[PDB]
Amino acid sequence: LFHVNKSGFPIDSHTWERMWMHVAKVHPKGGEMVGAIRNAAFLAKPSIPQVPNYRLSMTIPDWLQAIQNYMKTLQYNHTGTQFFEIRKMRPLSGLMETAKEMTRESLPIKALEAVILGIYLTNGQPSIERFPISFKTYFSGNYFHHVVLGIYCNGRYGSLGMSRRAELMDKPLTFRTLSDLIFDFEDSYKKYLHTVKKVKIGLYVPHEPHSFQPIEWKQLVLNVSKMLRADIRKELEKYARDMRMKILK
Amino acid sequence: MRECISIHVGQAGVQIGNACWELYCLEHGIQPDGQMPDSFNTFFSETGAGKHVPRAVFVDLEPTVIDEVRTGTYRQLFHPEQLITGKEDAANNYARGHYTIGKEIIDLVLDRIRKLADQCTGLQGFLVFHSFGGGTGSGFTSLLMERLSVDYGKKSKLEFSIYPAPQVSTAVVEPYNSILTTHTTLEHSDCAFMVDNEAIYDICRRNLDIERPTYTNLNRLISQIVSSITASLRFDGALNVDLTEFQTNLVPYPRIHFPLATYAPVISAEKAYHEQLSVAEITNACFEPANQMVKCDPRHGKYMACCLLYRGDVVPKDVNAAIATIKTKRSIQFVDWCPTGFKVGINYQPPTVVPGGDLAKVQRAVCMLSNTTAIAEAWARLDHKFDLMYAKRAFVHWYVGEGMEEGEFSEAREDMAALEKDYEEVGV
Amino acid sequence: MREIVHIQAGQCGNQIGAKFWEVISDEHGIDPTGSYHGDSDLQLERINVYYNEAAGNKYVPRAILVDLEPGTMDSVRSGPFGQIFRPDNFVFGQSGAGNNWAKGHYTEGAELVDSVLDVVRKESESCDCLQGFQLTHSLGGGTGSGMGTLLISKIREEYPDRIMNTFSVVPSPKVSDTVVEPYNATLSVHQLVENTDETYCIDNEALYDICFRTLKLTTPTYGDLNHLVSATMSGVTTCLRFPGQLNADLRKLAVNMVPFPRLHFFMPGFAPLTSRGSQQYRALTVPELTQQMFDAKNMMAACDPRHGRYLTVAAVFRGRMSMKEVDEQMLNVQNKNSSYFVEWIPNNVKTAVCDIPPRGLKMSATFIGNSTAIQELFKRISEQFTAMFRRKAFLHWYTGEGMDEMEFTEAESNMNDLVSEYQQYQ
Amino acid sequence: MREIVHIQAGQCGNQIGAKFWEVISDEHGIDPTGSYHGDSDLQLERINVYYNEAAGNKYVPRAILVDLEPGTMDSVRSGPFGQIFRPDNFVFGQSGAGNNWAKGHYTEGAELVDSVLDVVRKESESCDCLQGFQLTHSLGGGTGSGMGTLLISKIREEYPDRIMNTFSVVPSPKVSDTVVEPYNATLSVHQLVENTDETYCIDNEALYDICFRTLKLTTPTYGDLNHLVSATMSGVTTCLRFPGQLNADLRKLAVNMVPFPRLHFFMPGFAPLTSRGSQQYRALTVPELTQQMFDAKNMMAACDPRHGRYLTVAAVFRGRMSMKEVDEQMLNVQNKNSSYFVEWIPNNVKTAVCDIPPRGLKMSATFIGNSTAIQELFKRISEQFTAMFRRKAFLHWYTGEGMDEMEFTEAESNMNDLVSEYQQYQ
Ligand SMILES: Nc1nc2c(ncn2[C@@H]2O[C@H](COP(=O)(O)CP(=O)(O)OP(=O)(O)O)[C@@H](O)[C@H]2O)c(=O)[nH]1
Ligand SMILES: Nc1nc2c(ncn2[C@@H]2O[C@H](COP(=O)(O)CP(=O)(O)OP(=O)(O)O)[C@@H](O)[C@H]2O)c(=O)[nH]1
Ligand SMILES: Nc1nc2c(ncn2[C@@H]2O[C@H](COP(=O)(O)OP(=O)(O)OP(=O)(O)O)[C@@H](O)[C@H]2O)c(=O)[nH]1
Ligand SMILES: [Mg+2]
Ligand SMILES: [Mg+2]
Ligand SMILES: [Mg+2]
C-alpha cells in the first residue's frame, strides 16, 4: 500500500529511499530512468499554478469548473506516496492549515486531500454548500474505497473529486436529485466492471474555517448492492430532505 | 423498576396533562405540594425528606399555558426546569414547529429526557400527548419522536392524540397538519390512540346529562382512560397486563396499531342509584356504538383484536360469562382469522373520583380497547377535506415560505391512501 | 415578550389612537398618570406587550404619534390619558399636507420620516421578541394616506420578518368632506396591498348607521365611532395579553384567514351592541352574540355581505363560557347560510376564546370577515376616480410637487387587478 | 501619590477650570472656604490627588492660573469657590495677547513664561509620585493657543517621562466670533502633536446642540457648556480617586487607546443627559446608558461618527452595577455596528467601572472614542487657512512680532500629514 510522509518538510532520508525503492521495484524497466532522473544535472522548473479568486460577475457552475481545472492542472498523484498526512478525526482548523500550506507548496494530490482542497477553496461562498461522499466497492477479489465532494448550489447537485480514471471524479451541477447523482456514479463504476457494495454520505460542512468541528462521514450508510434501487432512492431522497432542512443532528 | 416518562406537547397536551397529574396525585395520595401525608415509583421519584417529583416533561413553544401551570395550584410539584417554553408559538403551521422554531429548543428538552431516563433503573416506555390539528403538536412532536427513536431504539412509545372531528372544528388548516403528522405517528409510534371532541361531547350530553360541557370534562375522561391503561404497572391483580404484553394481542401486523379506547360505566351521580351496574351490563355497554370516543360506526366494521382491562370488584367467572354472551351476538362481527380476540386483565383497585368532577362513585370499571377496522372511515372523511383544499393550493404559501417543500403534501396523501388500503386489505 | 409597536398618523389615526389607549389602559387598570391600580394579577404579567416600565413603577405606552401639524399633538397632550405618552415620541412638522398625496410622500413627509424611523428603531431595540407593528391612519387624505404608506414601506424593509397591521378608515361614498378622496385613496391603496399582512377596512357610514339604529343615539359624534373602532382594536389582540381556553395570536389569525397572499382585506364586527334603554330585554347568551355577529346590520364596513360568500371567518370570544355551545352554534350558522360561504373550504370559521371579558360587559365577541363582497368599496372608489380622471381635474396640485401622470394609471390598473382577484372566487 | 498638576490658560480655560474645580470640590465634600464637611472616608482617602493639605486642616487646590489680561483673575477670585486658590499661584500679564499667536509665544509670552515654570516647578517638588499634567485652553486665540503650547513644550523638555492631558477647545466654523481662528489653530496644533499624550477635542457647536436638543434648554449660557465639559473632565480621572471593580488610571487609557504614537486625539461623551420634563419616562439601566453613549447626537465634537470607524473606545462607568451587563452590552454594541469598528483590532472597548457615582445620580458613564472621523474638523480648518493664507490676509500682524512666513507653510504641511495619517486607516 502507498505510504505517507510524516516528517513535515523536507522529506527525510528514510521515506526518500523507501519511495525510490518502491518506484524502482514497480517500474518494469526500473533503474534506467530512475538513475537518469536522480543524476540529472538540470531539469525544467515546474510553473506555479495560481490560486483562482472568486469574482461576482462570473457564474457558480463556472466556478466549480474552474476549481476542477486547477485541480486537474495540479497533476494528480500516482507516485504511490502521500505527501501530506491527514487525520479524519482531526478538528477542522488543522485541516485548513494543511490545505493552505498544501496550496503554498502545490505538490501532487490524491482523492482525500483533493476533497479537502475543494472544501478549502469553496469555504468562501455561503451560497455554495458542500459535503462528502464515500464508496466501498469490490473488484477482482479485493475491496477498494473512494471519496468525493458533492455540492448543492442553486438547488442542483454536482460533484468534484479526483481519481486515476477520468469520469469518476467530476460532474456538473445538472442533477435534480441526489439519487440520480449516486446512480450515475454507480453506472460509471459498473463501466469499469467494479461492483459497489456500500455507500456512505456525511453532512454539510460548516462555513466557519477556524472551528474545531470534525468532519462526519458515516451519518448515513447503506449496502447498495444487496437492496433494489427503488428503496435506495426512497431512503436517499428522505435523507436529502432531512439534510437540506438541517434537521439531522 | 417499572417506570414510564410522559411528555406533553402543545396546548392540548399540557391541558390534558393537568388532569392526568391531578388524577395520579389523587390516586397515590400525594398532596399538591408533593409531600405524602411503593406503587408511586412508576410515575414519581422520591427526592429525600418525603418529596415526590413527577416524571414529566411539559413542552410548548409559547409561554401562556405553561405559565398558568407555573403560577397555578401545582407550582410546587413539577421540577422548575421540566417546564420548558419558547417565545412564539408554531401558529397552526407545521413548518414553523418542525423546522424553524422547533430547532432552537429541541436540545434543551432532549437533555432533560436523558437526565430523567438516567434516573430510571428499568424504563418501560414513553407516553406522548399531543394534538393533530396544531402546529406545535404536529411539527414538534414529529421532531421529538424522530430524535427519541434514534436515541432510545428499544422503548415503546404510546401516543394519545386528539384527532380532528368530522363537523366541529376550531381551525381552517387542520387537514394539512393532520396529514403531515400521520407520517411520524405511523412510522415511529407503537400504539396511537385517536380521540374526537364531538364524540366525547355527545357522551357527556347523553350519559352525564351535562348540556353545556367544556374541555375540562373531556380531559378528565381521557385522563381516566390513561389511568386505566397503566393500572397494571402500579397496582396488583389477578391478571396483570404490562405494556409489551398489552401491545402483543393487539397488533397483528406491524402497521395495524391504531386502536380506539372506550370506558364504562359513565353516568351522573344521581342516575347510579337506579342502575344495577353488574359486570354483564358494563360489558354490553362497552360494545354499543353510542359509547365510542371516536365519531365512528363500529357496526360497519369487524373487531380484529380486543382487550378488556377490568378493575375493581371483579372475578374471572363473570368476565368469562360476559365474553361468552358477547361472542354469540350477531351485530358484534369478528374476523375469521382471529378465533380468540379477548385479552383480559383484572385489578383490585376501583376507579377514583376527583372532588370537583361530575362522575359517580362506581365499584367496578372496564377499559375496552379495540383494533377494529371501522376507524378507516374516521380517516377517510379527513382525506376528503384535504382533497377540497389542495386542489386550489389554498394556504400553501405559508408552508412553502416557512421552509418546507411542496412534494411533502402529495407524499403524505399517498401514504394515507396506502394506509387505508392496508386496513381494507385485512378483514376480507 | 411578544410586544407590539403602535403608530398613529393623520387626524383619524391620532384620535382613534387616543381612544384605543384609553381602552387598553382601562383594561389593564392604568391611571392617566401612568401608575397602576389593577386589582388582579392577570393585568400585569402581560403588561409588557404594549407598555414599558420606568423608574417609580410607572408604565409608558410603546406608541409613536406622528403628524405634520402641531395642533393634533397639542390636542392629544391636553386631553385625558395624554400625559402618559413619552414626550420624545411625539414627532411633528411645520404645516400640514393640506390634503395632497405628493406633499406627504415626496416633499414634506420625506424630510421628517428619518426622525420617525429613528424613534421607531430606538423603541424596537428596547424589547426582546418583537411580534410586529400596527398602524392607524386614513386613506382619504395627504398626511395619513401618503406619509403612512412611506412609513410602512420603510419599516417593511428594515423588518422583513415581522407582521404589519393597518386599521385604515376608508372613504365613504355618501359621507364625504373633502373633494379629492379618490386620488389619495387609490394612490395609497396601491401600496397597502404589497407591504402589509392584515388590512381591517373601516367605513364611517357603517358606524353612523350602527349608532343610529342599534344604539339610538340622538346626535352621534366622532367619539362614539372611535369608541367602537377601539373596541375592535382591543378585541383583536386579547389572546396575547390574557389566558384563554384556546389562544389565538396575530399570526394564527393570519395563517387561518389568508388563503392566498393578496387576499387579506378584512372587515370587522363586534357584539353585543344594544341601546341603553333596551338593556333589560336581552337574555345575554351565546346564541344572541352569534346571531348578532353574522347580521348584515352589524359590520363596520359599508357593505352588505349578501352579494358575496365568506372565504374565511374568525371569531374571538371573551368571557367564561362553554366550548360546545360556541362550536355547535358556529356549525348551525354555517349550515343554514351555506349559500353565503365558499364550497372549496370545508371549515370556514376559526374560533378562539379568552377568559377575560371587557370591563362593563361579561361576555363579548369580535368578528373578522374575509368576505369576497368587499370588492364593491374598491369598485365605487375606482368609478369615482375614473370620473374625476376623465377631466384630469385637480391634477396640477399633484404634479406640482414631484409626481407623474403615469403613476395614477398604474394605481388604477392595480385596483382593477385586485377587484378582479376578489371577484374570481364568486 | 499619582498627583496631577492642573494649569489654566486663557479666558475659556480659566472659566472651564473654575467650573471643574467647583465640580471636583462638590464631589469630595469641600467647603468653598477650603474646609472639609463631607461624610464618607473614601473622600479623604485620595484627596491628595488634586489637593494639598495646609495648616488648620484645610485643603488648597493644586492649580496654576495664567493669562495676559488681569481681568480674568479678578473674575475668578470674585466668583464662587475662587478663594480656595492661594494668591501666589495667580500670575498675570500687563496687556492681553490681542488674539495674536506670535505675541503670546514670542514677544510678551516669553517675558512671563519664567514665572509659570517657576511655580509649576515649585508645585512639582511638593509631591512624591507625580503622574502627569493637564491643561485647559483654546486653540482659537493668542493667549491660550500660543502660551499654552510654549508651556507644554517647556514642561515636556523638563519631564519627558510623565504624561500631559490637554482638554483643548477647538474652533468651530459656524459658531465663530473671531476672524483669525485658522492661523492660530494651525500654529498650535503644529506643536500639540509632538508634546502631548492625550488631547480631548471639544467643540462649541456640538455642546450647543446637546443643550438645545437633549437638555431642552431655552437660553444656554456658557455656564451650562462649562458644566458639561467639567462633568467629562471629572469622569476621566475618577479611577485615581475612588475604588472600583476594574480600575483604570491615565496611563492604562493611554496604552489601551494609542495604537500608534501620533494618533492620540479623542472626542468624549457623557450619559445620562436628560431634560427636566423627561425625567420620569426613563428606567436608568445600563442598556440605556450604553445606547445614549454611542448615539451620534451625544458626541462633544462636531463630527459625524458614521463617517468613519473607531480605532479604540473606552467607557468609564460609575455606580454599583453588574459586570455581566457591561460585558454583554459592549459586546453586542460591537456586533451590531461591525461596519463602524476596525477589523484589525479584535477588541475595541476598554471598559472600566468605579463604585462612587456623581452626587445627583445613580449611574453615569464617560465615553471616550478614538475614531478616524475626527480629521473632518482639521480639514475644515485647513480649508479656512488656505482661504486666508493665499491672499496673505491679516498676516502682517504676525510678521511684525518677529515671526517668519515659512512657519505657516510648515504648519500647513503638518496638518496635511496628520490628516493623511488618520485617513490611512479607513
Ligand atoms: N371615526 C373618525 N373619523 C374621522 C375622524 N376625523 C376624520 N374622520 C374622517 O377623516 C376624513 C379625513 O381624515 P384626515 O383629515 O385625518 C386626512 P389627514 O389628516 O391624514 O391629512 P391632512 O388633511 O392633509 O392633514 C374626514 O372626512 C372625516 O370624515 C375621527 O376623528 N374619527
Ligand atoms: N465652552 C466655552 N467656550 C468658550 C468660552 N469662552 C470662549 N469660548 C470660546 O473661546 C474662544 C476664544 O477663547 P479666548 O477668549 O480664551 C482666546 P484667549 O483669551 O486665550 O486670547 P486673548 O483674548 O488674547 O487673551 C471664543 O471664540 C469662544 O467661542 C467659555 O467660557 N466656554
Ligand atoms: N380535548 C381537548 N382538546 C383540546 C384542548 N385544548 C386544545 N384542544 C384541541 O386542539 C386542537 C388544536 O391544537 P392546539 O393544541 O390548539 O394547537 P397547538 O398544539 O397548541 O399548536 P399551536 O397552534 O402552535 O399553539 C383544537 O382543535 C382543539 O380541539 C383540551 O384542553 N382538550
Ligand atoms: Mg398554542
Ligand atoms: Mg391633518
Ligand atoms: Mg483673552
Side-chain angles (χ1 to χ4, degrees), chain B residues 10-11 60 62 89 136, chain C residues 247 252:
Chain B
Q11 167 156 213
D60 196 5
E62 151 175 50
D89 57 54
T136 291
Chain C
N247 307 315
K252 281 172 75 103

Side-chain angles (χ1 to χ4, degrees), chain C residues 9-13 15-16 67 96-100 138 140-145 169 175-178 181 204 222 225-226 229:
Chain C
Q11 211 197 9
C12 301
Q15 281 184 42
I16 288 155
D67 203 357
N99 191 333
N100 190 300
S138 296
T143 324
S145 202
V169 171
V175 154
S176 65
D177 315 327
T178 120
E181 284 159 345
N204 269 310
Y222 286 158
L225 322 178
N226 295 337
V229 174

Side-chain angles (χ1 to χ4, degrees), chain A residues 106-124:
Chain A
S106 175
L107 260 53
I109 297 195
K110 295 216 185 283
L112 197 149
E113 66 201 299
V115 294
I116 295 295
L117 256 286
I119 278 174
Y120 167 80
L121 269 304
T122 203
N123 194 184

